[PDB]
Each structure stands twice: as structure tokens, then as C-alpha cells.
Design a protein around this ligand. Structure first.
Ligand SMILES: Nc1nc2c(ncn2[C@@H]2O[C@H](COP(=O)(O)OP(=O)(O)OP(=O)(O)O)[C@@H](O)[C@H]2O)c(=O)[nH]1
Ligand SMILES: Nc1ncnc2c1ncn2[C@@H]1O[C@H](COP(=O)(O)OP(=O)(O)CP(=O)(O)O)[C@@H](O)[C@H]1O
Ligand SMILES: Nc1nc2c(ncn2[C@@H]2O[C@H](COP(=O)(O)OP(=O)(O)O)[C@@H](O)[C@H]2O)c(=O)[nH]1
Ligand SMILES: [Ca+2]
Ligand SMILES: [Ca+2]
Ligand SMILES: [Ca+2]
Ligand SMILES: [Mg+2]
Ligand SMILES: [Mg+2]
Lengths: 54, 438, 422, 350
């Protein structure tokens, strides 16, 4: 229907056709999530080695 | 001129990156050694193609890209391959052992050890930019690195580049070529954590690409190579406006304002036509009406779903080749009268249209025949939520039994992150149904 | 990304030597460690199992362990005997006398530190060690008792690496001693806690296959080990040759093991060997057939949690998916529905010796519980009367440790049964 | 070997298709949440169409058309007919209808407008208010005063339709009784439209009384309303069901015509018009899974032998003596057509 914003250049062109109208976490916090996971890994490994020591 | 940096994460991101930068060079007349005989400004310049390539004083055109994988074998092939001369060493980053298809291993255990390095290699390219607009991030949903490391990278990019757009090209998992039972886990985990950090993401379901290669290229058993060459055509069609003279979509920002009114609903459906076998000698060249009409065939979508049963929030048509605006408007007129194209009430029923006169380039010795004209449609339709519903169902099946969850918990992830991620997805499915269903 | 291989005791070393013979031949390595193959694929992932020495020699990353010299002189004299690193033969002189207590606590403890010394040496030259592969039997004393002692100590020193075993389970049909159920039960308990992946190689099954299918009236360990050789080659293909699926030990574990304790696999192979190549449909049908299973469990008695299939040879990549899909779509009852797409398929172009094509099956099936039930009944029949127990308490063990091993195995059985009704 | 799953245990039609499938020995039934199926006999509400056709190596088929609800809901059928150029507001075979929302939330004033011109022209101004929440015989009001209509709708929370009540229905004799015709139509995956040979008349066993719309038993022809409130259930015919052979004989004896000429041409025309209208929206021609669906069209006939469309049911049951034939037919042209093993339908061409 209505064609608008027609722009032409050597490379090509663009336009808009309307047919009808309508009706973050900080570095530090990321840092603590990474360390919280690391500590859970170390804790689980510490338990394993303790169990192996027994 | 405003630069874009491309980041390629994990096997899928890297190999797709390969196919794209191969294609970019072919389209811009850049040779494998990085020279570009048509670029009469030696050493620099702010042409449209410089948004993706920097220049050495020796007339070398170098991609604004970084490749990252947690294991070396895939990136080693870039380092040794045809376009080895293209990238410099600092652009290709590899670890020793991968994330083993485990989001938690990619994000927490191994991610913590390489993230600062990767951000530094990225800070380098950023420092070469007079006006960085942001990032294009390529990755799989299913891989441990693609899912887990990408989401950690995206969190940090928002910290270190708050004002910058980030766009994704994401490979949605398909059992026909997938390599891990837990990819639905990885998909939901990465989508949950990346959601607030991505401004716009183009999902490619390997299922759809696989079937387009079988059906239209007559390839009985498509390879990653077949898939990626096709994918790179869609990617090229989508980025072409950033690399060539034009008035749409001239920068990453415009991608969001043209396709994404609802911030969380930032996953536009890509549809591409025509896809023609190069082994097909006599080929009748499709018209503008025909290739436009093919944009409303699910068989041509990057994700199989039924747009008739959803609503549109936005639609962009990107034509390459022999196309004049008159024929496009005639084609859209006729299609409007046949197809089911319901827009949401608060959006205009309409199409933004871009035409680049240079027809698609095809990798010589490829599977795709050269055509006179092609189109890529980007439409933000609620129908794409079918992919979320599929994925969430698989997640629900395994998680109810806690199948495989100990692999993630063992990497230091808490179980609650599972159900949190799943809840975010349940909300996501809810947002789509609100917007698109009477 | 290297694998360190360990073989312990008579069974472990004899099947271990065969494995190295067979894959040396696949990678084109001769008995003197020199390469003479005509394919590039042979050398691409060669370092996973082989070290390089000057002269371009390839030396197996293999450690040979035993409490008596006997079997290892046989190896060193055997076909590829000269290919092993001389320092990697670690052996004592007393033997374990088919006694788990001797292997695990008395005779074995005396020899284990020197073994760990060679393991440490091999690991220290590894670019990025994946983990370990151990061949052994569970019915004897050294492989079983010292083998599981090794596993525990290796885990203590390399707690973040993958531990994989090929464990030969005892059968009264091919039995050396009446105390095999004791040794096996004590060992299963170790495996459950300390391995990530175990291929259950059942001597019961190997015998029945030789007798029933291959028509061998009087099966020998040589015949049994022929089947074990082929199975081991087939299930390590994805580690040894380039490919997408299960290409290292951790990714395999992530695909195959949904719950940590349930990591005991039923291997299967086709064609069962001892002029016409099988069709892809024949490979597929046979590899899922109970008579091709190496664990002597009826797969129709349980359900598959996960499955890995590996096809070797030049065949229709297309026809493989059709067959693999058809097997699942036509017996979908025997696959748990709460692990979607739980069957993964690999193809490798290099066939094994003397075959144009073959297929190797790896199932995590709840039917493996039959194997543990069988051992558990044999164990209990003797333990209830404390028969032969004094040979174990005489090495410092008390009955309680038997009781706990028995409870742990019965628990394992109830866990399989748990998921077979889900 | 073909596989299927059953997800609607309350369906008499597909429970029969299920046993027919098993009885061929070439079909196997699966646990309802097993995805490796060829055929989904789906649930009525929120059937998960988005999870269909993503199973590598399985041609998948479902017994429902996604989007057919547009046809099979009171309000949305009205909307579909008014807003589709193929049907049009000047559609001559659909009674004058209006979609009315209760005020606790529309087409109210549009309905009043037309109601005035009738009261103004002495014209018969009896309308029937109904909805989709109306289970069986409850939730229906037949008034000649519009006020009682809208006041009754506001006593309900869901959307309603008001529609011109046919004051001159064809009356069967003896009995002087209203009736409606049920037609069963099967649409296969190729979008062939198949009209089942046998229909049935849901008759009233009470004489039509155009002076008392309060007694809903000579006005409503529902089988539940007759089997309860009517004191003459099964008097003239068994279960208030007159089948086509009898009805046609009647039309010949009484009116000197045939069922085919007087009524069936119109019925086939209406069925084609409705289903061709929505075809672009629901066809699974180039879709990754396939659909078929059994519909139940209900018709009214007036004393001029004009056929009026009342509604379309998307999950119809069948008459008792017709279950075997129609179910065998469903297996035959809708299922086995897609999954070949080792006519009772009239095809409405287009
Ligand atoms: N389209 C396409 N998909 C790929 C490609 N490579 C892998 N995939 C898909 O990506 C998923 C696997 O993720 P990968 O990218 O390979 O894994 P990764 O990012 O390297 O992570 P890890 O290996 O687990 O450390 C599966 O769904 C694959 O099918 C590719 O080259 N092209
Ligand atoms: N505009 C109208 N004029 C005359 N009679 C009408 C009418 N609308 C409905 N009826 C009568 O209303 C009754 C139909 O009810 P309705 O169409 O709502 O079906 P229903 O949903 O209650 C049960 P089913 O789905 O099996 O048809 C019939 O007996 C019919 O005679
Ligand atoms: N399949 C197979 N089984 C064996 C072999 N040698 C011994 N066995 C079995 O292993 C058990 C005996 O253990 P063995 O390894 O000989 O004792 P060890 O030297 O103390 O470890 C019994 O179950 C035997 O049946 C062999 O070469 N092949
Ligand atoms: Ca320049
Ligand atoms: Ca942001
Ligand atoms: Ca001593
Ligand atoms: Mg990887
Ligand atoms: Mg022995």
C-alpha cells in the first residue's frame, strides 16, 4: 500500500511498505558466583580425599 | 564507520565462523592472504567493509574476530587452513581440554580459567576501533563450551561494554546430528543466563538446515560442511547491510529497533530462498513473487514452526540481486491476500525492505547454485516459541528423574540453577502465548 | 589427550596383550613399534594410546602389573611382547593365590607403590591426560584385589581424571576357583564407588557364544579372548580415530551415565567371528540381539538408559540412520522415555582386520542387574555357611567387610530395578 | 509395524478406531507420552501440535487440524463467516448472528439495531441466545424480547452469540415436530473433503409450539433434552433418530421430492464453502507433520426446504448403528492412506 523512506544508492535500495496501521550483575557479583562454585568443587574433592584417607 | 567484532565460541561457532569469513572474503574480493586489490585506500579507511575488516600498513585486510574453544583441534584447522594467513595468532584462543558437553564445566570450572585471557584478546580488537558498535556471537546451544562459556562471556561483555549491542547466532540442537543426550539441559541453562545480555538472537535449528540440504541440495547425508555453507549464506544475508552501502539495517542497534519491540522476545525467525542444487544443470530462475512467497513456507525456515498460528511483531525482507522495489510491492500485495499474516494489534502490518544488487556469492565447488536473486526474511513471530516448548519438554522429561544432573553439580553448579533456568523458560513461553494467541 | 592403560593379573594381562596386538595392527604399528600403514587416519589420534620415541617409534602407554612373574614372561615373549616399555613391567614374586585379600591388603600393598611410580611417570609426560583404562578379571586375586587397590590409589592421586575398566566377571562355566563369587563381590563394591565407566565382560556370555553360536565344543581362553579383543577394539574406536561422538572418556561418560553408580555397560559385537560381508540391516539386527551381548543378560528383561552404536567399514551412512532409527521406533518400549534421543551412533571408515564391516554395541541397560543378581546368589550360598572364609580373615579381614560388600551389591541391584519401572 | 498413541480416552469414535487399528495386527499402541509414534489420536484441548513432526525417521499424523477451532466455536464461527469474503456478510445459508460479550468484560448495539427494524416491520423477531460454554441442553434462551437475551448473557461470564431463531422449521408428520440434521465429514491430509454417506436426524418427539419458547423440548432437538424432558422419547423412531433412508422416503411421500435434491445439494455446498474457506489457514500440505479431522456439521431445514447451518462440531460422536462403518472408513481413507497396510464417502471436489 504505502511506500515510505525510500533510500537509493549504487549498491541497492531500501524502503518500508505499510499495509495497515496498528490498534546487569557487576564484575564483583560474577566474581563471587565463580568462586562460590569453585569452593563447592574443592569441598566435594576434600570430602573424597578424606574418604580415601579413611 | 562503526566496527563490529565477531566472536566464535566452541566447535560450532568456530566452523560456522570459518564458512562466514570465507564467504565475506569472496563477497568483498579479499584473497586468502588478506590482500584486497580493489581497496585503493592502503593502510586504512572507513568504508563499509571496514566494519568487519581492519587494515595493516601492508594492505592486509584482517577480520575483526576472535575464535575461542576450550580444546585445540578445531581451531588448529583454522590455523593451518586456507585462510590461515587471514587471522593473526592472538585471534585464535584454545585451551587444553573441552567442556565435555557440560554447561557447568564450560561456565564455571574451565570458563573461570580462560575468561580473562579471552576478554584481553577482545580488548585488543576493541582498541583498534574508532567507534565499536558491538558484538556478533556465534555458538551452539548444545556444546559444553558453546553453551557454558558463551553465557559467561556475555555476562562479562555487558560489564566491560555496557553501551554495546550484542547479537547471537545460535545453533539449536537436533538429534539427527547432535552428539550429546544432555543438550536440552545445556540449551536451557545458557538461554536463561544469556537472556538479559542478548539484544537479538537468530536461532538456527540444525533439524531445519539438515532437511533443507536433503530436500533441496539432494544431499543424502548432509555434513557440518554442507550445513555451515548454507548457514553462512543466511548469516551473510543478515550482516550484508553492515558490510555494504545501504540505509537498512546500518548498525547493530537498528537490528533491535526493527525486529525486537519486546526485549525478552528477541528471537526472530529467519527464512531463506531460493536454495538450489549446483548439480542441477538446467535451472529455471525464480521470480521476485516466487522467492518472496517462499518466505512463508515452513520448509524454508531456519526453524520448523507454523507462523500461521502466532502473530508477527516485525518483518524485514532482505533481497540480494536483480530486484526492483516495484516487483517487491506487487509480490507483497498478492501474498497478503492469500497467506495467514496476523500482526499484533499494537504493531503496524508492514515490511521493512532492503535490496542489495549484488546477487549472492557461492563458494566455488559448493552445493549451492548461483541465482539471479535471493531473499532472506527476518520475522519476529510468536510461532518460534514452538522451539522453546519442544526443548522445555525434553528438559522436563530428564530433570524429573534428575538424569545426568550429578555431572553438573560435580562441576560446582547448584541444582537450583536447573529449576531456576526452567522457570525463566516457563515465563518465556508465557510471554509468547500472551502476545500471539487469541 | 592421552589415555594410560593398566593391565593386572593373569586375565588382565592376557586380554591386555591381545588388545595391544589388535589395535597396533589397526594403526599400522608393527611388533617393533615402527609404523607401516597406508592411511593417514591411523596416525591422527595415535597419541591417545601411544608414546613417540626417536626413530619415530611408537610405544604403548601401557603398564603391565602382576603379583607373579609367569604371565608377564608370556607377554614379553608373545607376538607384540617387545613393543612394551621394559620399565613398565611391574611384578612381584609371591602371587595372590586367587585371594582378593592377598591382592588388596597384604601381597598387593607391598607392590602398589612401584606401580604408582610408573603411572606417575607416564602421566607426567602427558600433554593432557584424559584418564585411565584398566583391564582385569574380578574372580581372581591380583586383577580383582590389587586391581581395585590400584584404582583407589589412582583416584586419590588423580581425582579429577576419568577411570575406565574392562572387568571380566566370573562364571561357574569357566571357573578357576570356588571363591570367585567372593572376589567378584568384594570387587564390584570398589567399582561402583571408584570407576566412571566399566565394560562388564562376562565369561558366562563368552562361553555361551563360543559354544552355542560359534559351535566350539571345547572353548579355551584363547577363544574367549578373541571375542574380548574384538569388543575392546570396537568400543575404543571413537577414542582412537577421528569423530564427533564419544571421542574421549569424559564425553562418553556424560552420554552414557545418568546416575553415578549405574556405570556398568553391556558390550555387544557383530558379526560374531571366530566370505560374505553383512548388510547394514544384518549388522544392526545382530548387534542388538541378546546372543551378541557380552554380559549374559537378557536386554528384553530391562530397559536401555543409554546406548552407543559404532559402525566400522565403508557402508551407507544413510542406511545406518534408517536402520538405527528403525530398531528404536520398533522396540521403543525397551528404551526409557525419560531420556530423549538416548541412542547415539558413530561411523568409522576403517574396518577391523578380516572384516569389510562390523558393529559394536554399548548399552547401559537395567538388565545388567541379572549379572549382579547371579553373583550375589553364588556369594550368599557360601557366605551363609562362611565357607572358605578363613582364607580371607587369615589375611586380616573381618566378616563385616563381606557383609557390607554384599549389601552394596544388592543396593546396586535395587537401583537398576528402580529405573526399570520408571 | 505402525505405532500410535491414545490421548483422548473420552472419545467414542477414536476408541473404536483404536481397536480397529490393533485388530489389523499391523498397529501397535504405545504409552501416551511416548514420542516415537506414527499416529497421534490427540486430546481435545491444548493438543501439542508444536511437538509433532520432529521425530527423525517417523512420518507423523494427528487426528486434528490445528486452527479448526475457528470453525468449531459459536462466536468464532460467526466471526469467520462475517469477515471472510468467500463467505461474506451476505451469506445466505447462515442465520443472522451477533457476538455479544457480557458487560462484566463486542457487537451489542449492532444486534439491537437489527432487532429494531424487525419489531418495526411487524417481522418475526424471535432470537436464540447460546454459547460454547453451554454443555448439552443448558445455557440456551429463546426469547422474542431482546432484553431477556442480554440480561441472561450478563448472568454468564463467557462470550455468547445471539442468532435469529428459525420460526418456520420443516415439521415431520405425524407429530408436527422440529429436527436437525447431523452430517459427518472427514478431511484427510490431502485436504480431500469426504462426506459420509449416512447422516442422521435428531428429531423432536414433541409437537412444535410457536407460542411457548419457554418449554425447551419442542424447540431444542438435543438427544439429551429429548431423552429426559420429552415424554415421547422413541415413540416415532428409535432414540429420536431418523436415518436418511426413512427421511428420504418421507420427503418423497409427503413433499414429492428427494433428500438429495431438496436438502443434500445445499448441505454439500455449505460444507465445501466452510472448509475451503479455512484451507489456507490449516492445511498441512507442506508441513512437517500431517493432519486429518472428523467434523460434525449440524443443519436446520425450514418449511421451504432451505438448509441452514447451525454449527460445526470438531470432536463429534456418532450414532450407535453407524460407528462401525464410519470408523472403518476413517481407518481406510484417513490413516491407511498414509500408512498402507499389507466407498461410504461422497467426495466433495474442489
Ligand atoms: N550447524 C552446525 N552445528 C554444529 C557444528 N558443530 C557442532 N554442532 C552442533 O553443536 C552441538 C555440539 O556443540 P559443539 O559446538 O560441537 O560443542 P562445543 O562448543 O565445542 O563444547 P564442548 O566440546 O562440549 O567443549 C551439537 O548440537 C552439534 O550438532 C557445526 O559445525 N555446524
Ligand atoms: N437459530 C436457530 N433457529 C432454530 N433453531 C435453532 C437455532 N439455533 C439452535 N437451534 C436449535 O438449537 C438446538 C441446537 O443446539 P446447539 O446448536 O447449540 O448444539 P449443542 O452444542 O447445544 C449440541 P451439538 O454440538 O451436538 O449440536 C437444536 O435443537 C436446534 O433445533
Ligand atoms: N576371559 C578370560 N578370563 C580369564 C582369563 N584368565 C583368567 N580368567 C578368569 O579370571 C578369573 C581368574 O582370575 P585371574 O586373572 O586368572 O587371577 P589373577 O591373576 O589373580 O588376577 C576366573 O574368573 C577366570 O575364569 C582369560 O585369559 N580370559
Ligand atoms: Ca581501505
Ligand atoms: Ca544489556
Ligand atoms: Ca613379602
Ligand atoms: Mg568441543
Ligand atoms: Mg589364574
Amino acid at each position: 500500500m504505502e511506500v515510505i523512506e525510500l533510500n537509493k544508492c549504487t549498491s541497492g535500495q531500501s524502503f518500508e511498505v505499510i499495509l495497515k496501521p496498528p490498534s546487569d550483575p557487576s564484575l564483583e557479583e560474577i566474581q563471587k558466583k565463580l568462586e562460590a562454585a569453585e569452593e563447592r568443587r574443592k569441598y566435594q574433592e576434600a570430602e573424597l580425599l578424606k574418604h580415601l584417607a579413611e | 564507520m562503526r566496527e563490529c567484532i565477531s566472536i566464535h565460541v566452541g566447535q560450532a561457532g568456530v566452523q560456522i565462523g570459518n564458512a562466514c569469513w570465507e564467504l565475506y572474503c569472496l563477497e568483498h574480493g579479499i584473497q586468502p592472504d588478506g590482500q584486497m586489490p580493489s581497496d585503493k585506500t592502503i593502510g586504512g579507511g572507513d568504508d563499509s567493509f571496514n566494519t568487519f575488516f581492519s587494515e595493516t600498513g601492508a594492505g592486509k585486510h584482517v577480520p575483526r574476530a576472535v575464535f575461542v574453544d576450550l580444546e585445540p583441534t578445531v581451531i588448529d584447522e583454522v590455523r593451518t587452513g586456507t585462510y590461515r594467513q587471514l587471522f593473526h595468532p592472538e585471534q585464535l584462543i584454545t585451551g587444553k581440554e573441552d567442556a565435555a558437553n557440560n554447561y557447568a564445566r564450560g561456565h564455571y570450572t574451565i570458563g573461570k580459567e580462560i575468561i580473562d585471557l579471552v576478554l584481553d584478546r577482545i580488548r585488543k580488537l576493541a582498541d583498534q576501533c574508532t567507534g565499536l558498535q558491538g558484538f556478533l556471537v556465534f555458538h551452539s546451544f548444545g556444546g559444553g563450551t558453546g553453551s557454558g562459556f558463551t553465557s559467561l562471556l556475555m555476562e562479562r561483555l555487558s560489564v566491560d561494554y555496557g553501551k554495546k549491542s550484542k547479537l547471537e547466532f545460535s545453533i539449536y540442537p537436533a538429534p539427527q546430528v547432535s552428539t550429546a543426550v544432555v543438550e536440552p539441559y545445556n540449551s536451557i541453562l545458557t538461554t536463561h543466563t544469556t537472556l538479559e545480555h542478548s539484544d537479538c538472537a537468530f536461532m538456527v535449528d540444525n533439524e531445519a538446515i539438515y532437511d533443507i540440504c536433503r530436500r533441496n541440495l539432494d544431499i543424502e547425508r548432509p555434513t557440518y560442511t554442507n550445513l555451515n555453507r548454507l548457514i553462512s549464506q543466511i548469516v551473510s544475508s543478515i550482516t550484508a547491510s553492515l558490510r555494504f552501502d545501504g540505509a537498512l539495517n546500518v548498525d547493530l542497534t537498528e537490528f533491535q529497533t526493527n525486529l525486537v519491540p519486546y526485549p525478552r522476545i528477541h528471537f526472530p525467525l529467519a527464512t531463506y530462498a531460493p536454495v538450489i542444487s549446483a548439480e542441477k544443470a538446467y535451472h529455471e530462475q525464480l521470480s521476485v513473487a516466487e522467492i518472496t512467497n517462499a518466505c512463508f513456507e515452513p520448509a524454508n525456515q531456519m526453524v520448523k514452526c507454523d507462523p500461521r498460528h502466532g502473530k508477527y511483531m516485525a518483518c524485514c525482507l532482505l533481497y540480494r540481486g536483480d530486484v526492483v522495489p516495484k516487483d517487491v510491492n506487487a509480490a507483497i500485495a498478492t501474498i497478503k491476500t492469500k497467506r495467514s499474516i496476523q500482526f499484533v494489534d499494537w504493531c503496524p502490518t508492514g515490511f521493512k525492505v532492503g535490496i542489495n544488487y549484488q546477487p549472492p556469492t557461492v563458494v566455488p565447488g559448493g552445493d549451492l547454485a548461483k541465482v539471479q536473486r535471493a531473499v532472506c526474511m527476518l520475522s519476529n513471530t510468536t510461532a518460534i516459541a514452538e522451539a522453546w516448548a519442544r526443548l522445555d519438554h525434553k528438559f522436563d522429561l530428564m530433570y524429573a528423574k534428575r538424569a545426568f544432573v550429578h555431572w553438573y553439580v560435580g562441576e560446582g553448579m547448584e541444582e537450583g540453577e536447573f529449576s531456576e533456568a526452567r522457570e525463566d523458560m516457563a515465563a518465556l513461553e508465557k510471554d509468547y502465548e500472551e502476545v500471539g494467541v487469541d | 589427550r592421552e589415555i594410560v592403560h593398566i593391565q593386572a593379573g593373569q586375565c588382565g594381562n592376557q586380554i591386555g596383550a591381545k588388545f595391544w596386538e589388535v589395535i597396533s595392527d589397526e594403526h599400522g604399528i608393527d611388533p617393533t613399534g615402527s609404523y607401516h600403514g597406508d592411511s593417514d587416519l591411523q596416525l591422527e589420534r595415535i597419541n591417545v594410546y601411544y608414546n613417540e620415541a626417536t626413530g619415530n617409534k611408537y610405544v604403548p602407554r601401557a603398564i603391565l602389573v602382576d603379583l607373579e612373574p609367569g604371565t608377564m614372561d608370556s607377554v614379553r615373549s608373545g607376538p607384540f611382547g617387545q613393543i612394551f616399555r621394559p620399565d613398565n613391567f611391574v611384578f612381584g614374586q609371591s602371587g595372590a593365590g586367587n585371594n582378593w585379600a592377598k591382592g588388596h591388603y597384604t601381597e598387593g600393598a607391598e607392590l602398589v607403590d612401584s606401580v604408582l611410580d610408573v603411572v606417575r611417570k607416564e602421566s607426567e609426560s602427558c600433554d593432557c591426560l584424559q584418564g585411565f583404562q584398566l583391564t582385569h578379571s574380578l574372580g581372581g586375586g591380583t586383577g580383582s584385589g590389587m586391581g581395585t587397590l590400584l584404582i583407589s590409589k589412582i583416584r586419590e592421586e588423580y581425582p579429577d581424571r576419568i577411570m575406565n575398566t574392562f572387568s571380566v566377571m566370573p562364571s561357574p562355566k569357566v571357573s578357576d576357583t570356588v571363591v570367585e563369587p567372593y572376589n567378584a563381590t568384594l570387587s564390584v563394591h570398589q567399582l561402583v564407588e571408584n570407576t566412571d565407566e566399566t565394560y562388564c565382560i562376562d565369561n558366562e556370555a563368552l562361553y555361551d557364544i563360543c559354544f552355542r553360536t560359534l559351535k566350539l565344543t571345547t572353548p579355551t581362553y584363547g577363544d574367549l579372548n578373541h571375542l574380548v579383543s574384538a569388543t575392546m577394539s570396537g568400543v575404543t574406536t571413537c577414542l582412537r580415530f577421528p569423530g564427533q561422538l564419544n571421542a574421549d572418556l569424559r564425553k562418553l561418560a556424560v552420554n552414557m551415565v545418568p546416575f553415578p553408580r549405574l556405570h556398568f555397560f553391556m558390550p555387544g559385537f557383530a558379526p560374531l567371528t571366530s566370505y560374505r560381508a553383512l548388510t547394514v540391516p544384518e549388522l544392526t539386527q545382530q548387534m542388538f540381539d541378546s546372543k551378541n551381548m557380552m554380559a549374559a543378560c537378557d536386554p528384553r528383561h530391562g530397559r536401555y538408559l543409554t546406548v552407543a552404536a559404532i559402525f566400522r567399514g565403508r557402508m551407507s551412512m544413510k542406511e545406518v540412520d534408517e536402520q538405527m532409527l528403525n530398531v528404536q521406533n520398533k522396540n521403543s518400549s525397551y528404551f526409557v522415555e525419560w531420556i530423549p534421543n538416548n541412542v547415539k551412533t558413530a561411523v568409522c571408515d576403517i574396518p577391523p582386520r578380516g572384516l569389510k564391516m562390523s558393529a559394536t554395541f554399548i548399552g547401559n541397560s537395567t538388565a545388567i542387574q541379572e549379572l549382579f543378581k547371579r553373583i550375589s546368589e553364588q556369594f550368599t550360598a557360601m557366605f551363609r555357611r562362611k565357607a572358605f572364609l578363613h582364607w580371607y580373615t587369615g589375611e586380616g579381614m573381618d566378616e563385616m567387610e563381606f557383609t557390607e560388600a554384599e549389601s552394596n551389591m544388592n543396593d546396586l541391584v535395587s537401583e537398576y530395578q528402580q529405573y526399570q519401572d520408571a | 509395524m505402525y505405532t500410535f498413541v491414545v490421548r483422548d480416552e473420552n472419545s467414542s469414535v477414536y476408541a473404536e478406531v483404536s481397536r480397529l487399528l490393533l485388530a489389523t495386527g499391523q498397529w501397535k499402541r504405545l504409552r501416551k507420552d511416548n514420542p516415537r509414534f506414527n499416529l497421534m489420536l490427540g486430546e481435545r484441548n491444548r493438543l501439542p501440535f508444536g511437538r509433532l513432526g520432529h521425530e527423525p525417521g517417523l512420518v507423523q499424523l494427528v487426528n486434528y487440524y490445528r486452527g479448526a477451532d475457528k470453525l468449531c466455536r459459536k462466536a468464532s464461527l460467526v466471526k469467520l463467516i462475517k469477515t471472510s469474503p468467500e463467505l461474506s456478510e451476505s451469506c445466505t445459508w447462515f442465520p443472522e448472528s451477533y457476538v455479544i460479550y457480557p458487560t462484566n468484560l463486542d457487537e451489542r448495539e449492532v444486534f439491537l439495531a437489527a432487532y429494531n427494524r424487525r419489531r418495526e416491520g411487524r417481522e418475526g423477531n424471535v432470537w436464540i441466545a447460546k454459547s460454547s460454554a453451554g454443555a448439552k441442553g443448558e445455557g440456551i434462551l429463546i426469547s422474542s424480547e431482546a432484553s431477556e437475551l442480554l440480561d441472561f448473557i450478563d448472568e454468564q461470564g463467557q462470550v455468547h452469540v445471539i442468532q435469529k431463531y428459525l420460526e418456520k422449521p420443516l415439521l415431520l408428520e405425524p407429530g408436527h415436530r422440529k429436527f436437525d440434521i447431523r452430517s459427518w465429514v472427514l478431511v484427510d491430509h490431502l485436504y480431500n473433503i469426504y462426506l459420509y454417506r449416512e447422516g442422521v436426524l435428531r428429531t423432536s418427539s414433541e409437537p412444535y409450539n410457536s407460542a411457548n419458547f419457554q418449554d425447551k423440548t419442542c424447540h431444542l432437538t438435543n438427544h439429551c433434552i429429548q431423552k429426559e424432558y420429552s415424554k415421547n422419547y422413541g415413540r416415532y423412531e428409535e432414540g429420536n433418530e431418523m436415518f436418511f433412508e426413512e427421511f428420504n422416503q418421507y420427503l418423497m411421500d409427503a413433499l414429492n421430492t428427494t433428500l438429495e435434491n431438496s436438502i443434500l445439494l445445499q448441505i454439500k455446498h455449505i460444507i465445501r464453502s466452510c472448509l475451503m474457506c479455512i484451507e489456507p489457514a490449516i492445511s498441512t500440505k507442506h508441513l512437517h507433520y500431517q493432519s486429518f479431522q472428523l467434523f460434525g456439521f449440524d443443519f436446520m431445514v425450514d418449511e421451504e426446504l432451505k438448509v441452514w447451518l447451525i454449527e460445526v462440531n470438531g470432536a463429534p460422536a456418532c450414532a450407535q448403528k453407524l460407528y462401525a462403518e464410519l470408523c472403518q472408513g476413517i481407518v481406510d481413507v484417513a490413516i491407511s492412506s498414509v500408512f498402507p497396510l499389507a466407498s461410504i464417502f461422497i467426495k466433495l471436489h474442489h
